[PDB]
Amino acid sequence: TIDGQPLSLSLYATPADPSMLLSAAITASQGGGDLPHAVMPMYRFPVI
C-alpha cells in the first residue's frame, strides 16, 4: 500500500497432525519339558 502493508494476504500452511502411537507385544517360544529316564521302584502300583 502507501504505508508499505501488502495488499495480497499471506499463505497459511497447514500444521502437522498429531500421530497415533503404536505398541506391540512380541512373543517368545521356548522348548517344552522332555521326559527323563524312568527308574523302577520297589513298591506296588497303589503305593507308587
Binding site: 527308574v39 521302584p41 520297589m42 513298591y43 507308587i48
Partner: protein, 49 residues
C-alpha cells in the same frame, strides 16, 4: 523332602535277609587263646564267684 523321598525310592532295593544262629560254646571252644568249655566255666564261676 521330595528330593530325599525320590532318592530313597530310587535307591531302595529288597533285601538279603540272613539269619545266623551262633552258639557261644563253639566260639569259646574255638577261641585259639585261653579257650575253654562253657558248661564247666559257668559252674566254676558260679560256685566261685
Amino acid at each position: 523332602l521330595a528330593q530325599m523321598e525320590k532318592s530313597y525310592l530310587e535307591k531302595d532295593e529288597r533285601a538279603l535277609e540272613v539269619t545266623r544262629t551262633v552258639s557261644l560254646a563253639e566260639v569259646y571252644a574255638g577261641l585259639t587263646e585261653n579257650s575253654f568249655i562253657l558248661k564247666d566255666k559257668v559252674t566254676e564261676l558260679v560256685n566261685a564267684g
